[PDB]
Design a protein around this ligand. Sequence first.
Ligand SMILES: Nc1ncnc2c1ncn2[C@@H]1O[C@H](CSCC[C@H](N)C(=O)O)[C@@H](O)[C@H]1O
Length: 382
Amino acid sequence: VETPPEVVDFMVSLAEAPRGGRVLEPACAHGPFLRAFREAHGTGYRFVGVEIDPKALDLPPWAEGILADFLLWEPGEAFDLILGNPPYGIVKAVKDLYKKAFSTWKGKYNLYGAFLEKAVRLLKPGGVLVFVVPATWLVLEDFALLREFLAREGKTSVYYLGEVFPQKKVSAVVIRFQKSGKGLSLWDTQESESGFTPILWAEYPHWEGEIIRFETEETRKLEISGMPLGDLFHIRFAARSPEFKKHPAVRKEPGPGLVPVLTGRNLKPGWVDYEKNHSGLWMPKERAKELRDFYATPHLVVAHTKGTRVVAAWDERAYPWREEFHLLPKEGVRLDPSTLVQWLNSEAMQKHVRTLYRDFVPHLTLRMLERLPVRREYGFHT
Ligand SMILES: Nc1ncnc2c1ncn2[C@@H]1O[C@H](CSCC[C@H](N)C(=O)O)[C@@H](O)[C@H]1O
């Protein structure tokens, strides 16, 4: 993803460093941030750039260039200011090595997470870092260890930019971090002719690494006046195609006594389309429970393939599914399906989920789902 000029401008104005202080740009190429900073803040600093590809390293005379893998680079020096746009993405052994090297590494992780941990470690006390990175780390669990690390190493400011790169499936966020432990500040941002204008949204001085959300008075009212979905239901996952394909009784052409294996396109807001087959697999309904027992019990289905919105339906016939979230009520819990469903698909529920998580991620996640508030008269534990 390329960095627009106005975004670079925005980051440079959040950047500060003492005269004579060292300024570094990891994964520099021709050094776009080194250049912009010098023009806006002056020449009285030491400029360094670290690039792994010698063909890409193209820095002006006043800057010092280092050919190396930033992630494995040990300068023996600490910096005052670190800024840049780290590569986004996942990558064995160079990886494995990394895993050993980085404590916040969890799951598949992402290179931008490693660059973050690395950058924070090369910072002098009180030093600052300004990076443009994806917004996924705010809600995903692979980044739970990263959030804690940041939470305890200094104060964090998160500025929401959104989908600002010409490539539209990535929502961006600018993080300004100073190595002087002191909570979290969430900022919104206004886009105009001049560039970006920040707007303080909320402050969390006691932040310990919890999920970051855009909360409002109304979202709070809604969450305290109900029970979270995750208290009333067990959230199960469906079996995948391989599991189905390895199952005798599973066919590939229709036939008598065979029902289609339902997918997300069969799920509509408020109802299920049992007609269309979108998987190309069929099997006798009664043998479904052999793959997952809950397949034999009529239950609630919420989608994860339809974006950041709540689409729910009650599977009254109990058919086999290849995806989506499957909710089975906990013991003692008695609910009214019809109204629970109406509630979940409501225009109130969509605005709630939209306000809090915006477009951080491309689809509803387990953590977002389990906190959805079930208004008292739809379901309760007896
Ligand atoms: N491990 C590493 N160490 C140092 N430089 C690296 C590096 N990995 C990539 N780079 C360099 O940093 C530049 C990529 S910049 C990343 C742009 C954008 N955020 C994206 O996701 O694509 C390239 O010039 C590359 O050579």
